[PDB]
């Protein structure tokens, strides 16, 4: 999965 | 002499893997008669080549600050790995050598509660919404509010405390109209912290 | 040659009628060959002369710690007197002079609210109480916990945070065993500040 931000990527494991 | 000061990169853009980490290495109270300065950069005790140095700037007391910036890997930098400066200048007898690292200590996943407004607090014009995040380490975090896909800037968070279990707390307190709040609007606290899933936690607030 | 600091009283000090609350002017880099320190004390530019002298102390760095404690009534303090250590050694060209007072501006009173544990935080050993204190002006402030007559010491507090509108906060968080906290039992976060009604204030918690 991934995790975003306002929009923004963060992370994916 | 010249003084040298070693900068680790923001947390949020050793976090955000669409951001770009950097370490920065700064020279101060370069003289004007020798102004050229040496950088050897390494990580790990191993010498890397892709430094860039900043422009040159003048600083009001007649001497120059130089900077060079090394960019680094998201892991590397989460990994611990141990960055060094080497400065060497002719005013300087002999190199002056600087490190930095992140904490090195286990990494504990951040604990993240929301909390409500005191009944005691709803006479006010305004309400505290409060993020309390606990259990972390290292004290590298970032945190922020939002409603409804937009920031809500109106905030205030504490620094990291040391807690009795070697561990890091703080709170984060966002002010808003009362009425706001009244009117069954959801707000979001934003923790990004190495430790996370993915980085990454968000809790949310309503009236109920 | 030596170096001066000029320090306030403690905060609680100031703010309990039984303490006694000092401002301290230490002397650091004192010379072996020349220890000899004279201090002049004002307030408000009228010179006292009922200042004490701690016993001088060795820092086994070729240097002494040499210092001055002025004593200060309660109200002097809070009413934003200002305190001026004079500092003369023959290692001196000059006559070091340093001032300490309270910080300046309107006083404001804190507003005190506890805060239970998070619904998601029921499932863990120990739980956090937390005591909110919002909207004091000067930030000096002592705050602590209690429950049922006992002090309650397994807390820890922020400093002092700057706000929006010019006067600080700060957060307290008390952790207790989840067993203690579902049980019904009271616990109180205590608040002096000067502003607030003689001094000091209580607000409690409880499931
Ligand atoms: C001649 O003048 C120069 C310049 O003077 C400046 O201009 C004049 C007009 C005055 O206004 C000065 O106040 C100005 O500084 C003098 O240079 C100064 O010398 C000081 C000592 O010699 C030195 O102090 C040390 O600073 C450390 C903190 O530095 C921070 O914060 C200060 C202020 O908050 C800021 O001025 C500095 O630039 C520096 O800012 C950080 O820069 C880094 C690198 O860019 C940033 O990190 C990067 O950020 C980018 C994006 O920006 C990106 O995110 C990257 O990922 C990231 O790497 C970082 O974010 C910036 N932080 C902030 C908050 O802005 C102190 O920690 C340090 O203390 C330590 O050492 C002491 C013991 O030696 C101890 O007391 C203490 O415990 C600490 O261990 C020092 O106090 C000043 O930095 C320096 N000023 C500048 C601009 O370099 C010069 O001294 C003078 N010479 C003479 C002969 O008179
Ligand atoms: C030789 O050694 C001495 C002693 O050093 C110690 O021993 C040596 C051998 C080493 O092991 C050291 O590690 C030890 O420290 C050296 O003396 C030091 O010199 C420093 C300056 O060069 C000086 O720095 C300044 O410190 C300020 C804070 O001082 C506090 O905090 C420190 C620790 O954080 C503490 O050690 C100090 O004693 C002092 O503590 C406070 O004392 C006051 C007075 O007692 C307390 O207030 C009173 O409390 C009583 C009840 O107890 C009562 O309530 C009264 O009402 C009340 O007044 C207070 O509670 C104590 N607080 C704490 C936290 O402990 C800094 O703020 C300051 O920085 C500021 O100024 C700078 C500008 O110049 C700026 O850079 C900066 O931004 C700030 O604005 C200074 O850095 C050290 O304090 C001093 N240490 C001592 C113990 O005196 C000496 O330098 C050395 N010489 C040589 C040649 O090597």
């Keep these: ?13 | 002499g010249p003084s040298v000061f070693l900068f680790p990169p923001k947390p949020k853009d050793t976090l955000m893997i669409s951001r770009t980490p950097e370490v920065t290495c700064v020279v101060v109270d370069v003289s004007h008669e020798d102004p050229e300065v040496k950088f050897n950069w390494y990580v790990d005790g191993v010498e890397v080549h892709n430094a860039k140095t900043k422009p040159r700037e003048e600083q009001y007391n007649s001497t120059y600050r130089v900077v060079s910036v090394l960019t680094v890997l998201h892991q590397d930098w989460l990994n611990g790995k141990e960055y060094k400066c080497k400065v060497s200048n002719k005013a300087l007898p002999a190199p002056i050598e600087k490190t930095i690292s992140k904490a090195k200590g286990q990494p504990r996943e951040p604990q993240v509660y929301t909390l409500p407004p005191s009944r005691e607090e709803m006479t006010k014009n305004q309400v505290s919404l409060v993020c309390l995040v606990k259990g972390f380490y290292p004290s590298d975090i970032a945190v922020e509010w939002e409603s409804n896909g937009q920031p809500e800037n109106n905030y205030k968070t504490t620094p990291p405390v040391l807690d009795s279990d070697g561990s890091f707390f703080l709170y984060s307190k966002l002010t808003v109209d009362k009425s706001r709040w009244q009117q069954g609007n959801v707000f979001s606290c934003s923790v990004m912290h190495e430790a996370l899933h993915n980085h990454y936690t968000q809790k949310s607030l309503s009236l109920s």
């Design chain 1, 1 to 13: 999965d991934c995790a975003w931000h306002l929009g923004e990527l963060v992370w994916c494991t």
